[PDB]
Design a binder for this molecule. Structure first.
Ligand SMILES: [Mg+2]
Ligand SMILES: [Zn+2]
Lengths: 455, 1341, 49, 50, 51
DNA sequence: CTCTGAATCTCTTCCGACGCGCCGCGA
RNA sequence: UCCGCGGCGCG
DNA sequence: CGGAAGAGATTCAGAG
């Protein structure tokens, strides 16, 4: 039915009607002894009508309706991307699902996503009915419904009770590779944005400029056991495309670590000796030494011995205050040399990989979380920022460009004297411009990259 | 000098380049084309008159009677625009046409008339464009996008062998009419020439050539060049042009002047050609092999027998040569085949043709075009003739004629719209020349080749369709019956015309729904250009080459503004200065160069002419004499940039900004940032939402004034004067004495659109921005609109921004916001939603609106009146009833045992059920307006009668207040005329105003003026009473509504929405960001003076996106407010105004060689104080797009502001109280809210409705459906071993009509069992496959 | 049922065999005007045939 | 010749836009082909299980 | 309409255990045919099935 | 000089992500 | 409680 | 539209 009491007829009904009509006409022309050519015309029309019914548009001009569109025959209900096979048999719409705009949450552990309270209430409303009747607070489904729609805070207590171990699935369209769907143990936040852990967000190929994400809740207990054992993000550390880890930091985390490990030739408190990394942290936080200052520190490390024991060693090493601070979080078993250099993205990647090979899964997970926290905090304290004076323009550039244009004029006038073909003139001009551009780039990099300071 | 109004907030320009041409009226194309469509025209060139004359008159032969057209006129639109928008009726006016019917006598001459009848036909209703350039269709605003399509004419095109792939090149030339069949001509890998009609088939070209009245020998004589040979006994002569020798190899000795000389086996070169030319050779003697291998040009006859031995296109058979030579026909004619210059292609076509004669080709063409029917000579002839040469079935419009001739280099510019024989043969010759290589194919993507078709052309096309349908109806009426006893009023049916025009305006792909987020968005949508639509192009078939930029886009189409995604390239925006040539080609202004001095005259060019000349780059520096400083001035010409001397330059760009549209032009510092990010920012700027309170942007572009005034939202001073009165909603202005027309009241009034639903649910509000007694000037802005302040565009807001990573809350473009922003309602926005309630005559009695609702608490009903309508002003929340409506449920018979079961249960199982309208879930707000519309003959309820009473009272008070104001103006004019002389001011003062108007102070023209205004007063009171009577009948009259509805009720709900984490905000340079945290104001970083930062952005995005310009913007912001802060303090200390005056003069002088040059010495001190009051909040800075502020000027401005010269400052972290070691960039930035609020997207469904056929859950937020587990996600699950969750996803959660019930039961019971049945969609598939006639069934049950 | 059509022609009563129901239609010069009105759930609805 | 810090003239900017719209159209088209290819590969290899 | 594209006598009742003639209204006669018409006292699900 | 097979040419058919959101219209 | 078609819009 | 693949029809070369 339609508004105003009208009805939308499915095109199949119209095709059926037409075929019925033609059949009735042919039978009437037969039973009243029509002439030959008339019944031949009627039966040819009937055959054409059957062709339209099954596969309209398969031959000749397609049938069309008042909208001047071709009617969808039975065959069109199975062919094509709108067909029954692709649309419904695969790719079903599903109950117990929601969608929301995502958002960074840095305070989350690795395996827990921040889920808005309203969505949680809506999704788990059946479970809430169940537990509310089970605990005897509500007697009938009507009572449960009216209670939950009034949000009597006891419903909020029940809701906090239900989800405590109940993993949910997060999905980002398009699900390019299987990492696109992952399992998380929810945490309840007021607001309306789903909060992710940035590390896995890097794996999602997602960003935060307004990307939406969909959440599904498993129903059965076998299903949630599967979600926990297989899909939980604490398991998907290694990509399937290659052995290297997928959980790798980027942006502020890497910037913070890089700043934390970079040393300078002269800084506050250079050359002093620290009896332990804790004292390095103290001297930094008390403000008597800057992170970049180089210092000797007593440090203990461990190695997996031939038997499998973490045999200890302790020694004095030259390092930086920042490097000692970072080392303090490193779990037992990794060698100190891993830290004692300017840490880039690739260095952190290989550090995570070597952690995962040397030690088990869980120390690597804890190491990842600690890395994320410390990197963010020290990046914030760093206060790195970009200013217009930073993009220094190498003053050589004007000279180099004048040289290049002089050569361009020279080759152009050489062509003006007819000494060369135009194509080779073009080639020469292109070559000299490329050479000049490379020279300018080298000058810019040389001027920017290094600077002089007093010792 | 500045107008007095503009003295408020004189924005500081920085542009160095002067401006020689003001930006044109931005909407001009739409308004002027529609005017051209509707306005009267005696010449019948365009619009209604042209359309009518293109069909009329109409003549009947057996009827011996004629229908002919006198004139057309457009009636009055019965409803005003706001009434149309309120009541939902299309804004239209009646089309009236004067028509005459003629009958002649039944004797020669047929022209002897005997009777004439004339009357006016109401042949249709037509929409009118509103003053803002938008149409009003039903209840909606709609604006027609001007299309850009391939021009009619002829084009020449080649593919780089892609089709055949052997490496050759193939050519085709195509002719496109304005309407009618296409023709295209094509070569072949076998070098045959083929012709095709509407791309039907592929046929040799000779078919048409003989279909045209030409025989084979005529064809050869026309297309090819002929050579003559003579035979005498067995000696052979040929007649030669020496140049004809060029190209061949002299394998045999060749004779001239009686001497024979050839280097055998060698190619004839220019020395040989010159030798023969100086020899002046005419006829030479050649061997038999030379004439061998030559084609027979024509038939040859032997008179000794009356026999023919030579045919057309035949090779030279030596036997035939001997026979004809002995017969006596010693002369022979042959063609010439230069392997490069004179390809034998036509001859090969003549060989391969199946046809033999004109009628054979005609019937073959007919059977090609009309398969499945027996050919007939008349049928084929009629088909061909009417197809190409019936000026009504086919027509190259005049633009088609111009392009056709100009591509064929013919002198003529005009001609008949139908083709001809010479046209076809000429285009074929041109294609042959192209195949020879003495030419070049055409470039269709070139902008001198595509054409802009505006609304007028589409409107007249649809109206012509209506006219031809009506013409068929009229000729049918003429044929069917008598001619005397009827009037053409009945002969013409308006039905087809109205159907066609309404179908165009409602349905058509180019009649797209308008967007109204902000005035800029409305402007850019009106101006937008689309390549799609009727006769256009499809997103699937659009290759890269049409999308890509073409070098003649410069100055005509903005390259930046294109939308992103699959539509890219196919949608564009007019550049700011571009205007349409009468032929629809784009046109750009330029400045004439005259011997090194720019004349400053303006000339308009199209892509062809621009390509022909040399035009200088805009940024070229000049002296005051007009001579360029540099001799080697850089310029562009013929699609390439280079350097040229001062004298070679022909034209100069008008202004720097002429390459970009308005949308890009608004962005400051555009010259400093990448194109991708600039594009994204330009597009995003359209989506901005108007805030609760407008704010100026500090770093603007000057364009804001023009855009704000040109859009329709702001009320502009149409007549200068002094503002007499202002309130929240009305403006009354006294027109000055000189400006007012004689007999006018001298007072004008404006009424502001106080609150209404925008087309995207945003608010639309107009706020006055003047005060009593302030002078106002022609073109001043009296009332601001949405996102407008003092007549400047005010999309965004000014925020204090620090660039610094902060604890990951700004990770990956995330934005962190200080709570102070929320507390000040800086980004709070007002939204309006409209809800409709429809009452219908349901089964077992109507469904009625009422407050008598079953099974509901009375407290909710108390919010409603006794009629069942909420009182305006009541707050309402999700799930509550706004209006009560009730549906009968039919009989609902209960057996007596069920009757007693119901009785013990209660009042349940009622035959009457609630249907009342309910608040959408999660929405809450306040109820601002209620509307009712009801069918005639039904009683008006309490709510209906009360609102009708209030509305009629409103109309009465409005009309009476208009009367009072205008009569006060009239009597003020009485005073002004009477004081002029012969005064009796006190003697009149004792008398009441009626005496003043009645009495005569003199006997002269003054008394004539008094009598004139008294008659004016009588006329205005009579028109006022007539207007109020019409208004009252118009209010009291019922409405048509729709079928079956008794009455509709609409209620208006308004909601205030607030910035919240998950909301998306973005800055003009295109750096989107989701707000991810609000912060207690204490925690935000704060500078040395203790004022906190407001918004913290991640810096890491800047180098990788290359949005360097935005950083510069930030710096300028820190400078701008700097001055503001200082001047604010300088005001707060309440010092002498002269000191701040000199300071302001310094601040304006600060620029170097800036065009501004404003001086305060002419300003009186109260004006200076007003200026300071507006400048207290910062000094707005104007930076043109490509002549913007330089870094040196920025530094100087900062230095005058006492801020750090680098723009970086020290900063303290509030959360610990320590100091960041690095300096940080803190400044001011302009930010927008992007209308993607989180509460519009968050959605969740536990369970709900289910679809009918597939039994799957519904889709979409509105239906409260669930998300779609697409096939990619299914593959993702398959990649894991997670079988069980997949099975649960498919069977139980989605499609099992019983399994999900079992699951719901077990979950409620607390048992997480599962039972997978069968997906019902599988049974659906089985039934459809079986219905197809294919047996499919399960096995092993 | 509506006695006259929108053109002011006069109306006649006809049987729609395909839906077993009465309807009203108008004629001019004895030919059908191509206008019809039907009864659908206690209301009369009208339009082109 | 001018870098991003100094202003680009209108000519440099205009010629630069070519690459920008080329890249945007490039990615717009590439997405569809990539998705289609993935659908194919999945269909061919979906039977194989250890 | 009987013998039509939606003829209830063929495809079964539009409503659960409701005869087109109104002869029977409840499950007490579940699984019987009407005498005035060939519709069957059954569930609406049969409408989905029968061809 | 003719017949058959193979090769080439012509004509017809199939395919060119996934996901959400609003608006209009609808014999 | 609903089959869409067209259109913009964001991923 | 364009590109690629398949099927049918027509033409050329080799062998008899
Ligand atoms: Mg994204
Ligand atoms: Zn029955």
């Amino acid at each position: 039915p339609l508004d105003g009491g009208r009805f939308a007829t499915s095109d199949l009904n119209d095709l059926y009607r037409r075929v019925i009509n033609r059949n009735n006409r042919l039978k009437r022309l037969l039973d009243l002894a029509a002439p030959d050519i008339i019944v031949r015309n009627e039966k040819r029309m009937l055959q054409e009508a059957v062709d339209a019914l099954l596969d309209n548009g398969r031959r000749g001009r397609a049938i069309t309706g008042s909208n001047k569109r071709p009617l969808k025959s039975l065959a069109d209900m199975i062919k094509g991307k709108q067909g029954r096979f692709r649309q419904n048999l695969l790719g079903k719409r599903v109950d117990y699902s929601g969608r929301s705009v995502i958002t960074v949450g840095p305070y989350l552990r690795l395996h827990q996503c921040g889920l808005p309270k309203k969505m949680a209430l809506e999704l788990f409303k059946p479970f809430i009915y169940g537990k509310l009747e089970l605990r005897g607070l509500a007697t009938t489904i009507k009572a449960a419904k009216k209670m939950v729609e009034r949000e009597e805070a006891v419903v909020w207590d029940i809701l906090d009770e239900v989800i405590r171990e109940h993993p949910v699935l997060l999905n980002r369209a398009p699900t390019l590779h299987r990492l696109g769907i992952q399992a998380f143990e929810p945490v309840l936040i007021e607001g309306k944005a789903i909060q992710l852990h940035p590390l896995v967000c890097a794996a999602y190929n997602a960003d935060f400029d307004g990307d939406q994400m969909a959440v599904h809740v498993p129903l059965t207990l076998e299903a949630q056991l599967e979600a926990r054992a297989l899909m939980m993000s604490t398991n998907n550390i290694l990509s399937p495309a290659n052995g290297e880890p997928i959980i790798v930091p980027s942006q502020d985390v890497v910037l913070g670590l890089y700043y934390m490990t970079r040393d300078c030739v002269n800084a506050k408190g250079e050359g002093m000796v620290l009896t332990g990394p804790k004292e390095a942290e103290r001297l930094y936080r008390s403000g008597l030494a800057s992170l970049h200052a180089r210092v000797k520190v007593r440090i203990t490390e461990y190695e997996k011995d031939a038997n499998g024991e973490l045999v200890a060693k302790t020694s004095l090493k030259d390092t930086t205050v920042g490097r000692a601070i970072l080392w303090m979080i490193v779990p037992k078993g990794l060698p100190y040399s891993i830290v004692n250099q300017a840490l880039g993205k690739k260095a952190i990647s290989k550090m995570l990989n070597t952690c995962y090979r040397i030690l088990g899964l869980k120390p690597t997970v804890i190491f990842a979380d600690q890395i994320m926290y410390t990197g963010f905090a020290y990046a914030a304290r760093s206060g790195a920022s970009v200013g217009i004076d930073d993009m220094v323009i190498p003053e050589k550039k004007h000279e180099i460009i004048s040289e290049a244009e002089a050569e361009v004029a020279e080759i152009q006038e050489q062509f003006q004297s007819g000494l060369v073909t135009a194509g080779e003139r073009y080639n020469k001009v292109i070559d000299i411009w490329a050479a000049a551009n490379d020279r300018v780039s080298k000058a810019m990099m040389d001027n920017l990259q290094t600077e002089t300071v007093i010792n | 000098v500045y107008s007095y109004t503009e003295k408020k907030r004189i924005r500081k320009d920085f542009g160095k380049r002067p401006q020689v041409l003001d930006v044109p009226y931005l909407l001009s194309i739409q308004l002027d084309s529609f005017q051209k469509f509707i306005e009267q025209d005696p010449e019948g060139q365009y619009g209604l008159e042209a359309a009518f004359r293109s069909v009329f008159p109409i003549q009947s032969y057996s009827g011996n009677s004629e229908l002919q057209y006198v004139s057309y006129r457009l009636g009055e639109p019965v409803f005003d625009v706001q009434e149309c928008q309120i009541r939902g009726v299309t804004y239209s006016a009646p089309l009236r046409v004067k028509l005459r019917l003629v009958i002649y006598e039944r004797e020669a001459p047929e022209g002897t008339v005997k009777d004439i009848k004339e009357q006016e036909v109401y042949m249709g209703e037509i929409p009118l464009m509103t003053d803002n350039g938008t149409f009003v269709i039903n209840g909606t605003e709609r604006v027609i996008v001007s299309q850009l399509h391939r021009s009619p004419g002829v084009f020449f095109d080649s593919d780089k062998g892609k089709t055949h792939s052997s490496g050759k090149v193939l050519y085709n030339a195509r002719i496109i009419p304005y309407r009618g069949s296409w023709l295209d001509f094509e070569f072949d890998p076998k070098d045959n020439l083929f012709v095709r009609i509407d791309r039907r088939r592929k046929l040799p070209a000779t078919i048409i050539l003989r279909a045209l009245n030409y025989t084979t020998e005529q064809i050869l004589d026309l297309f090819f060049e002929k050579v003559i040979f003579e035979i005498r006994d067995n000696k052979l002569q040929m007649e030669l042009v020496p140049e004809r020798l060029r190209g061949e190899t002299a394998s045999f000795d060749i004779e001239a002047n009686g001497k024979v000389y050839v280097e055998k086996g060698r190619r004839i070169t220019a020395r040989h050609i010159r030798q023969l030319e100086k020899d002046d050779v005419k006829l030479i003697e050649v061997p038999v092999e030379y004439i061998a291998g030559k084609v027979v040009a024509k038939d040859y006859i032997d008179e000794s027998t009356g026999e023919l031995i030579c045919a057309a296109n035949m090779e030279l058979s030596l036997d035939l040569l001997a026979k004809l030579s002995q017969s006596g026909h010693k002369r022979i004619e042959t063609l010439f085949t230069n392997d490069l210059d004179h390809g034998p292609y036509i001859s090969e076509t003549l060989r391969v043709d199946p046809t033999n004669d004109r009628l054979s080709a005609l019937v073959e063409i007919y059977r090609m075009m009309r398969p499945g029917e027996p050919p007939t000579r008349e049928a084929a002839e009629s088909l061909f003739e009417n197809l190409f040469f019936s000026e009504d079935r086919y027509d190259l419009s005049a633009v088609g004629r111009m392009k056709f001739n100009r591509s064929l280099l013919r002198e003529e510019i005009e001609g008949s719209g139908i083709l001809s024989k010479d046209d076809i043969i000429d285009v074929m010759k041109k294609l042959i020349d192209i195949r020879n290589g003495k030419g070049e194919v055409d470039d269709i993507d070139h902008l001198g080749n595509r054409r802009i078709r505006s609304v007028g052309e589409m409107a007249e096309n649809q109206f012509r369709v209506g006219l031809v349908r009506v013409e068929r109806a009229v000729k049918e009426r003429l044929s069917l019956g008598d001619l005397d006893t009827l009037m053409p009023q009945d002969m013409i049916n308006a039905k087809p015309i109205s159907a066609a025009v309404k179908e165009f305006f409602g349905s058509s792909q180019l009649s797209q729904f308008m967007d109204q987020n902000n005035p800029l968005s409305e402007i850019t949508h009106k101006r937008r250009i689309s390549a799609l639509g009727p006769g256009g192009l499809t997103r699937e078939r659009a290759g890269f080459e049409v999308r890509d930029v073409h070098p003649t886009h410069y100055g005509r189409v903005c390259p930046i503004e294109t939308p992103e995604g699959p539509n890219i390239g196919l949608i564009n925006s007019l550049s700011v200065y571009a205007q349409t040539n009468e032929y629809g080609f784009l046109e750009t202004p330029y400045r004439k160069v005259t011997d090194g001095v720019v004349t400053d005259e303006i000339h308009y060019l199209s892509a062809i002419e621009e390509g022909n000349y040399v035009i200088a780059q805009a940024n070229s520096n000049l002296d005051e004499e007009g001579h360029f400083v540099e001799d080697l001035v850089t310029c562009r010409s013929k699609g390439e940039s280079s350097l040229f001397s001062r004298d070679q330059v022909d034209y100069m760009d008008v202004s720097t900004q002429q390459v970009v549209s308005v949308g890009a032009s608004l962005i400051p510092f555009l010259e400093h940032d990448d194109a991708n990010r600039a594009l994204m920012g330009a597009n995003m700027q359209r989506q901005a939402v108007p805030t609760l309170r407008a704010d100026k942007p500090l770093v603007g572009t000057g364009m804001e004034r023009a855009v704000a005034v040109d859009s329709g939202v702001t009320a502009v001073a149409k007549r200068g004067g002094v503002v007499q009165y202002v309130d929240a909603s009305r403006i009354v202005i006294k027109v000055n004495e000189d400006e007012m027309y004689p007999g006018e009241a001298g007072i004008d009034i404006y009424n502001l659109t106080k609150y209404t639903r925008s087309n995207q649910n945003t608010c639309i509000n107009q706020m006055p921005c003047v005060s009593l007694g302030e002078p106002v000037e022609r073109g001043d802005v009296l009332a601001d609109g949405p996102s407008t302040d003092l007549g400047e565009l005010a999309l965004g807001q000014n925020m204090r921004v620090a660039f610094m990573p902060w604890n990951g809350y700004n990770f990956e473009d995330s934005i962190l916001v200080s709570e102070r922003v929320v507390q000040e309602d800086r980004f709070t926005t007002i939204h309006i939603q409209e809800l409709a309630c429809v009452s219908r005559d349901t089964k077992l009695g109507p469904e009625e609106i009422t407050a008598d609702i079953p099974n509901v608490g009375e407290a909710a009903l108390s919010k409603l009146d006794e009629s069942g309508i909420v009182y305006i002003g009541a707050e309402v929340t999700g799930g509550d009833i706004l209006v009560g409506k009730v549906t009968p449920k039919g009989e609902t018979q209960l057996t007596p045992e069920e009757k007693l079961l119901r009785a013990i249960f209660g009042e349940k199982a009622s035959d009457v059920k609630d249907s009342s309208l309910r608040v959408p879930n999660g929405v809450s707000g306040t109820v601002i307006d209620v509307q009712v519309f009801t069918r005639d003959g039904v009683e008006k309820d309490k709510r209906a009668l009360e609102i009708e009473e209030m509305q009629l009272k409103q109309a009465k008070k409005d009309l009476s207040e208009e009367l009072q104001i205008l009569e006060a103006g009239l009597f003020s004019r009485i005073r002004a005329v009477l004081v002029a002389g012969g005064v009796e001011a006190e003697k009149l003062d004792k008398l009441p105003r009626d005496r003043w108007l009645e009495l005569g102070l003199t006997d002269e023209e003054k008394q004539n003026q008094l009598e004139q205004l008294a008659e004016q007063y009588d006329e205005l009171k009579h028109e006022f009473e007539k207007k109020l009577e019409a208004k009252r009948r118009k209010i009291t009259q019922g409405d048509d509504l729709a079928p079956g509805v008794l009455k509709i009720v609409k209620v208006y709900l308004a909601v205030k929405r607030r910035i919240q984490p998950g909301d998306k905000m973005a800055g003009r340079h295109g750096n989107k960001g989701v707000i991810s945290k609000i912060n207690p104001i204490e925690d935000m970083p704060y500078d040395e003076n203790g004022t906190p930062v407001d918004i913290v952005l991640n810096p890491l995005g800047v180098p990788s996106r290359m949005n360097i310009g935005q950083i510069l913007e930030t710096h300028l912001g820190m400078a701008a407010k700097g001055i503001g802060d200082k001047i604010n303090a300088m005001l707060k200390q309440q010092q002498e105004v002269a000191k701040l005056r000199e300071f302001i003069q310094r601040a304006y002088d600060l620029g170097a060689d800036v065009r501004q040059k404003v001086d305060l010495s002419t300003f009186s001190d109260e004006e200076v104080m007003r200026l300071a009051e507006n400048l207290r909040k910062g000094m707005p800075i104007a930076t043109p797009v490509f002549d913007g502020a330089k870094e040196a000027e920025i530094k100087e401005l900062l230095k005058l502001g006492d801020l750090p010269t680098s723009g970086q400052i020290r900063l303290y972290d509030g959360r610990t109280g320590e100091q960041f070691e690095r300096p940080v960039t803190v400044g001011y930035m302009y930010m927008l809210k992007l209308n993607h609020l989180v509460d519009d997207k968050m959605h969740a469904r536990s369970t709900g409705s289910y679809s009918l056929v597939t039994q799957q859950p519904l889709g979409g937020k509105a239906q409260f459906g669930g998300q779609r587990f697409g096939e990619m996600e299914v593959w993702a699950l398959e990649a894991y071993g997670a079988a069980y969750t997949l099975q649960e996803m498919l069977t139980v959660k989605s499609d099992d009509v019983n399994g999900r019930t079992k699951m719901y039961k077990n979950i409620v019971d607390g048992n997480h069992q599962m039972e997978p049945g069968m997906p019902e969609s599988f049974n659906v598939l089985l039934k459809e496959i079986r219905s197809l006639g294919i047996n499919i069934e399960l096995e092993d049950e | 049922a509506p006695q006259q059509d929108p053109e002011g022609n006069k109306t006649m009563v006809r049987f729609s065999r395909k839906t077993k129901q009465q309807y009203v239609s108008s004629e001019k010069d004895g030919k059908a005007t191509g206008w019809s009105a039907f009864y659908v759930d206690g209301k009369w609805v009208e339009g082109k045939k | 010749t001018a870098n991003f810090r100094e202003g680009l003239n209108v000519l440099q900017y205009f010629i630069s836009t070519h690459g920008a719209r080329k890249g945007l159209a490039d990615t717009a088209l590439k997405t569809a082909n990539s998705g289609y290819l993935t659908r194919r590969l999945v269909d061919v290899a979906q039977d194989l299980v250890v | 309409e009987r013998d039509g594209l939606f003829c209830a006598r063929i495809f079964g009742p539009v409503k659960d255990y409701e005869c087109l003639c109104g002869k029977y209204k409840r499950l007490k006669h579940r699984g019987v045919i009407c005498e005035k018409c060939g519709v069957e006292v059954t569930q609406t699900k049969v409408r989905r099935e029968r061809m």
